Structure 1
Amino acid sequence: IIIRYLVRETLKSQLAILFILLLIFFCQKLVRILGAAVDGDIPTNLVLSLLGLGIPEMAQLILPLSLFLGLLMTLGKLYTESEITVMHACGLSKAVLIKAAMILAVFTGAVAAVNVMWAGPWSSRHQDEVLAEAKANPGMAALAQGQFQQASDGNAVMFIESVNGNRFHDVFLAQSVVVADSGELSQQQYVTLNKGTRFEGTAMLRDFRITDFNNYQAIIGHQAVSADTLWKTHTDRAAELHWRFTLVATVFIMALMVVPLSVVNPRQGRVLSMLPAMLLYLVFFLLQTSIKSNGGKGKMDPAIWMWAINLLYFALAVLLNLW
């Protein structure tokens, strides 16, 4: 029942550092969502909902890391207190802590499985969406203000120089131009621009449209839809399920790998001894993300380098455990 003590400690650490890792990841996810709010010219209404949209995408790295580092901290802190070396002084096996890690690795591997079969594709469904009613239909929430607004593909581009939304300027639009002074907008949706001029004279012989001070409207607000290789009996394989299943495989590889990476080095430097064990995870995850480049999903299938290093690393995970 000494296993029950070992798993009680990892629940105290993993389920606490998981909360801490959520916050670090949340911040970096908030950086890029803030980055797109200025440079990418994306609305502010979907900022907080996109933060929540990426939490099952974030969990891909926090879940195999929390079980890895939680185990690294606990075994390390129990090693220092001499509890780990006294567990072995009174009989026991090195497999006691491997058993304890693997018995709590199934708990996390199951949550990683929900984050793959259910949570994984749900985010992908709303990431293809990016909220169509807000992306394809830019309204008052879009607000150009002193800068351009590139839309569609190079042609559509609005340019405003407004006070609040009562006295606009420049307009432009292009899609071969249209420049207006005063203007207003009120969604349900019409661009009631007062003084202005129109144009569409491409050549010296080609036609050209013109306008003046009238309250133009053009009631437009077309709510665009989603458009506007998997299992396979045979041992198909390889198209991103090489990664989608590897992030659940990582829950069990790091659990076995770090057990003797926390009880053989902290005699030297309490936290400097965590550095070699941690560095290994980094290179591993840096290469798995790098293998996910030579033709990703669907048609182009990735060559077995992802599962090749997953076994080369499992060979490394058993190597130190036999010592």
Structure 2
Amino acid sequence: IIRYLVRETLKSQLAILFILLLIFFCQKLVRILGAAVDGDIPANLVLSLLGLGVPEMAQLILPLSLFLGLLMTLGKLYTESEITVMHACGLSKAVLVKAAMILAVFTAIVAAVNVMWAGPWSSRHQDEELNWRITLVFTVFMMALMVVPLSVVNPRQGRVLSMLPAMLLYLLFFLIQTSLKSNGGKGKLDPTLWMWTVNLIYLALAIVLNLWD
């Protein structure tokens, strides 16, 4: 079986996830992690620093990890021209989007736990609307459908510039998606329910590019 797609791209998944979690904590893992060797040693200094910033950067970078690691090595596969014979053995785009949704649901469980079981930890160790938990497990569920035809690199006109139309579309997503949730308020407070629609309107231009008829 050609399950190799998920087995290869999960390496890039974990690689880009760890290399982008140690960055954005560089100025903490330098400063306070170095000052703790001489100055002060409690347990909840390094544990406090580990608890600093981990849930929102988890829930934000792990979708980025998916649509950037699925861009990188699968574009290497395109530019080493391997899909042009894999494609040429009775397959279609269906097998790539099936592999993409399989790796996306494999990361859906960690994308689920780093909100659902990191919430009360965030309360207790950070004090020191429920549609959002469907939109967040949906926004990893859509990038696997979105980037698979978007970086479809030709063997003769190839480049790394293809990451820009996959990152700015996520940015025009995520400037709006969290700003419409700061409208309204907390919990049972009610802003406009157009966040029920922006996910669907992104599913629309996902699925047309995946169709291409």
**TM score, norm. by length of structure 2:** 0.84
- Identity in percent: 90
2:149–2:210 contact (8 Å) kept in structure 1: yes
Task: Summarize the Cα distance change of 1:290–1:50 in structure 2 as closer, same or farther, 3 Å threshold.
Answer: same
Q: For this pair of structures, how many residues does the alignment match?
A: 211
Deviations 1:204-224 (A, max 9, x none): xxxxxxxxxxxxxxxxxxxxx
- Shift in Å, 1:84: 1.2
Structure 1 segments (4+ residues) deviating >6 Å? 28-45
Task: Summarize the Cα distance change of 1:283–1:39 in structure 2 as closer, same or farther, 3 Å threshold.
Answer: farther
Task: Summarize the Cα distance change of 1:124–1:30 in structure 2 as closer, same or farther, 3 Å threshold.
Answer: farther
Deviations 1:95-127 (A, max 9, x none): 111011111111100111111221123112322
1:17–1:70 contact (8 Å) kept in structure 2: yes
The structure with more helix, counted as a fraction of residues = 2
Unaligned 5+ runs, structure 2 = none
Paired residue secondary structure (2:20) = helix
1:265–1:273 contact (8 Å) kept in structure 2: no
- Shift in Å, 1:242: 2.4
Paired residue secondary structure (2:56) = helix
1:102–1:252 contact (8 Å) kept in structure 2: yes
Q: In structure 1, how many angstroms separate the alpha carbons of the residues matched to 2:126 and 2:117?
A: 15
- Shift in Å, 1:259: 0.7
Q: In structure 1, how many angstroms separate the alpha carbons of the residues matched to 2:106 and 2:165?
A: 26
Task: Summarize the Cα distance change of 1:75–1:55 in structure 2 as closer, same or farther, 3 Å threshold.
Answer: same
Structure 2 residue aligned with 1:123? 122
The structure with more strand, counted as a fraction of residues = 1
Q: In structure 2, how many angstroms separate the alpha carbons of the residues matched to 1:241 and 1:36?
A: 40
- Shift in Å, 1:299: 4.5
2:80–2:155 contact (8 Å) kept in structure 1: no
Q: Which has the higher contact order (CA 8 A, sep 6+)?
A: 2
Q: In structure 2, how many angstroms separate the alpha carbons of the residues matched to 1:251 and 1:55?
A: 18
Unaligned 5+ runs, structure 1 = 129-239
1:17–1:66 contact (8 Å) kept in structure 2: yes
**Bigger radius of gyration:** 1
- Shift in Å, 1:296: 2.6
Task: Summarize the Cα distance change of 1:8–1:37 in structure 2 as closer, same or farther, 3 Å threshold.
Answer: closer
- Shift in Å, 1:24: 2.1
**TM score, norm. by length of structure 1:** 0.57
Task: Summarize the Cα distance change of 1:265–1:40 in structure 2 as closer, same or farther, 3 Å threshold.
Answer: farther
Q: In structure 2, how many angstroms separate the alpha carbons of the residues matched to 1:30 and 1:71?
A: 28
